[PDB]
């Protein structure tokens, strides 16, 4: 269950991996070696559930990486931050076939000042971010979107189904706020 729990007498856990730097700077992506993916029966593009410190969780898409060590997982700063981990920390990864196309999500900019200072947030940030990307997201995520001429961080307030979903073309996106 927890990263922080174990029984004394236990078959080892191949799904505990050491956090390493991303080469792919995408918020939705984590990378494993192909042998580690084979061992975990993970398929390229599968949605996965990651567990970090302080019972934080994240959902990502898993890709193979030929430079990744078998025991390591590459992830970007945004995912590290959502998991409350640092490089060299341990996370757990598990298959997450439970993820459905979402009916609606509710997000908001965590900075109260940005909307006034930039271009339309849906058109300049959210749409380009999610469009044709089929990203998994989880309630509580803070994610960073690089649009226009400055990045804007968004928090996921809620998803339907809860607490995670894939943002599909017919997913209703509510930003307020």
């Amino acid at each position: 269950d927890d990263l922080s729990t174990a029984i004394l007498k236990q078959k080892n856990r191949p799904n505990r991996l050491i956090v390493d730097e991303a080469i792919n700077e995408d918020n939705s992506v984590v990378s494993l070696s192909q042998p580690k993916m084979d061992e975990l029966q993970l398929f390229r593009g599968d949605t996965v559930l990651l567990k970090g410190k302080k019972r934080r969780e994240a959902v990502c898409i898993v890709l193979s990486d030929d430079t990744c060590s078998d025991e390591k997982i590459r992830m970007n700063r945004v995912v590290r931050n959502n998991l409350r981990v640092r490089l060299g920390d341990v996370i757990s990864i598990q298959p997450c076939p439970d993820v459905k196309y979402g009916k609606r999500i509710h997000v908001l900019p965590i900075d109260d000042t940005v909307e006034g200072i930039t271009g339309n947030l849906f058109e300049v940030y959210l749409k380009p971010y999610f469009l044709e990307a089929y990203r998994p997201i989880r309630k509580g995520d803070i994610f960073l979107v690089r649009g226009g001429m400055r990045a804007v961080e968004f928090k996921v307030v809620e998803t339907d189904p809860s607490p995670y979903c894939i943002v599909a073309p017919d997913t209703v996106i509510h930003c307020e706020g």
Partner: protein, 80 residues
């Protein structure tokens, strides 16, 4: 084993199609597969997400190997 591409394809409703193709198969063989399941070329695109690209927008005569769909990929059917 002679190179195979396993493709998992999300339908518009979010469930899956799955099929293994020889990697030397023409991309046309994949178009034909989704069409046979109810998703004809003129109604649906077939997307990959890393990188984001429109697979249906590729040369149907090229092989899966040629077009970089190998050995595993998750694709997405999306109404045109």
């Amino acid at each position: 084993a002679e190179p195979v591409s396993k493709l998992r394809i999300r339908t518009p409703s979010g469930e899956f199609l799955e099929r293994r193709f020889l990697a030397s198969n023409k991309l046309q063989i994949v178009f034909d597969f989704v069409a046979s399941k109810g998703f004809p070329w003129d109604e649906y695109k077939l997307l990959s997400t890393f990188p984001r690209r429109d697979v249906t927008q590729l040369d149907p005569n090229k092989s899966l190997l040629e077009v970089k769909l190998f050995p595993q990929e998750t694709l997405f059917l999306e109404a045109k």
